[PDB]
Design a protein around this ligand. Sequence first.
Ligand SMILES: CCn1cc(-n2c(C3CC3)c(Sc3cccc(C(=O)O)c3F)c3ccc(Cl)c(F)c32)cn1
Ligand SMILES: [Ca+2]
Ligand SMILES: [Zn+2]
Ligand SMILES: [Zn+2]
Length: 751
Amino acid sequence: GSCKGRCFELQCRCDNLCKSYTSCCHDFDELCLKTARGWECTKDRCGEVRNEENACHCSEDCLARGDCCTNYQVVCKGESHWVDDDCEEIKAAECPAGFVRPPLIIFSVDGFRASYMKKGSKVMPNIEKLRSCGTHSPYMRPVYPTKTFPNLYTLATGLYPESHGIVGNSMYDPVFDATFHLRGREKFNHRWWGGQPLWITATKQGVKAGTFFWSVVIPHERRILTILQWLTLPDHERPSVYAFYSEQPDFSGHKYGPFGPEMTNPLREIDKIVGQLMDGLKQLKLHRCVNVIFVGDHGMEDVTCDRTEFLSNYLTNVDDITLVPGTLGRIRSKFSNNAKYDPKAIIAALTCKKPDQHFKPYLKQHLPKRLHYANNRRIEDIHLLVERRWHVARKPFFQGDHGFDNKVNSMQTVFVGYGSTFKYKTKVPPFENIELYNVMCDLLGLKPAPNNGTHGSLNHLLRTNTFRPTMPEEVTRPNYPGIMYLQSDFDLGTEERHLLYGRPAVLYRTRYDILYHTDFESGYSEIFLMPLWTSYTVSKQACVRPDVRVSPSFSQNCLAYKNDKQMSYGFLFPPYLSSSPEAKYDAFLVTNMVPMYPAFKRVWNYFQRVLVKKYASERNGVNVISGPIFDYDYDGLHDTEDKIKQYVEGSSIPVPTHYYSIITSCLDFTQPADKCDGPLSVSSFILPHRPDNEESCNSSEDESKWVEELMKMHTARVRDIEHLTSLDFFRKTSRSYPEILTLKTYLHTYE
Ligand SMILES: CCn1cc(-n2c(C3CC3)c(Sc3cccc(C(=O)O)c3F)c3ccc(Cl)c(F)c32)cn1
Ligand SMILES: [Ca+2]
Ligand SMILES: [Zn+2]
Ligand SMILES: [Zn+2]
């Protein structure tokens, strides 16, 4: 066959991907990749006859045909560049006839650090306009690992990488007994690629996507010309979504570091390509008809060959393991059934050997929960977090790299929405990339497939929403037991002050009791034998007895803790904060008691005694909600009874894998936490309930030199705690639901 009259068609091959499969026709290049006389019109070419060899055209007939060089109108008919033009509000999608929807163009840039924007109008006048004139955020949080393949599919699917299955730029699938690599053919097999990506979510809903992926080898000018060509196609072929991908500024960034002087140029070059796009759209009357998302997959840190830890310095039988190196570590047995592979012995020998050590080993279950990086068969049990700026290798030409913890400033990236449906000159707070599938679905009138975004957490990005969020229905209503039993029946051995924003909704089927006291309020699980939440309010200037409301059948007992050689107990409401000593006895009710390992009590007690008081002076009062979390299967979802693998030796007292707190005050801190009229300020964590402090290499010193650091590492979104508990919080406030969602997606990094 031949590509004559077929270049960049929508289905021998002649579409944009045909190169990738080594299948484009003999004359693909000749006809489809035309490079003659460059990409800009110039004075000499106004008024020419059409010539077929040319790269793009500067004759009158080009405008209909769709294929003028993007500056033909500038150079030849007097018109200005888009960049040169004033910021004008787009209050309605000015589209041509038969455009059902404002089309959408996702413009990916690789390794685009959010700091690169500081550089600004000198280096990138076009991108700056998109930011200045549209809707932007100081930065966007990616996902971990901060690598390209995991981060691009998360934008496409709205899912965490453990969910969509692209868990790394490279992975071994123990069931497929095969491996996936950036460079290679294995990745082309769809079997690796779960969720429902945006191109599939649209096809199924009748909204046309086209051929969505380009072969990398095609240059960026040919790509954007072809995009403009397709937007003059008649209404039955025209796609309504498009995507463009620049492997820059990442390529240069690895070569020169992010703060390299040699970065100036690759970014101006990119802005070249963005301007061509707006110039091109303005000459097709489309520049006030299309929504354009300028977005990155990650940023970029400084990293040199000599900042490289070696496992062979820590381990003796190192030829026995396989290591996925770089800005993260993943370790598994090299050989099949090698009994001289002991994972316990690996973790132990990597733990705190060296004073200077620049990584930390985790069993994936023990990684902070915010990373949602465990529930996949291609995440090996042993994970090494690496310190920013450092590399881990196995055995003993670049200046930047990335892959680190996604809370890290250098790993943050950009987002700019600009078009008819995006707000005008609107700066919005940081958010996570997992929230972009839904928004992108809102921009095409698509119902989003099930995902990890919180639909409605981002409606303040847009001038009009096809989606109103609604609260979830309360599955189990509370009992309010009065006094019911006597202290003879036991064989052991508020809403104005303490529940400021309404009670959490229990979103699964069970029985539970609300219990009132002077200092706190609590919802108490009969199934789990402890509270699911304890709410209480410390103001700025601030023995275990039976609960006579709860059956002996449904209570815990001290005896169980005597049986268990390893387990102790702690209290959700901290006795240390009771208002009077009369009231202090309430804190020792068996219903405020929870099973804690001694190694954990050091962390818990420090938090309760020192930090809550602290945070209550700092933020003019706080309302804390604390409880337990069961996630034995590490899916990030609350556990059913049949999944709990640990009980307090002897009993039916289930052991939590984590404990959470949600800490809230008035954002306006001139008003105390309890007398607050406007928006909230929140901070949060989920701490792993482990029996050692082997995570904290400083654990040997006084709790002030290491606890608060441990907590900050396990900062978490309210939403994360909602997934883990099946509770729903902030259901009774003075604020609009979508603002509460935004509140509930907020992560307080400490950078
Ligand atoms: C199953 C849904 N799906 C996933 C892809 N997909 C692919 C193809 C399968 C390898 C790549 S990789 C790639 C693309 C384009 C060109 C080339 C090339 O070698 O020239 C290439 F290697 C990819 C990257 C990011 C995202 Cl978000 C995807 F959805 C990607 C296409 N569909
Ligand atoms: Ca679970
Ligand atoms: Zn990348
Ligand atoms: Zn890279």
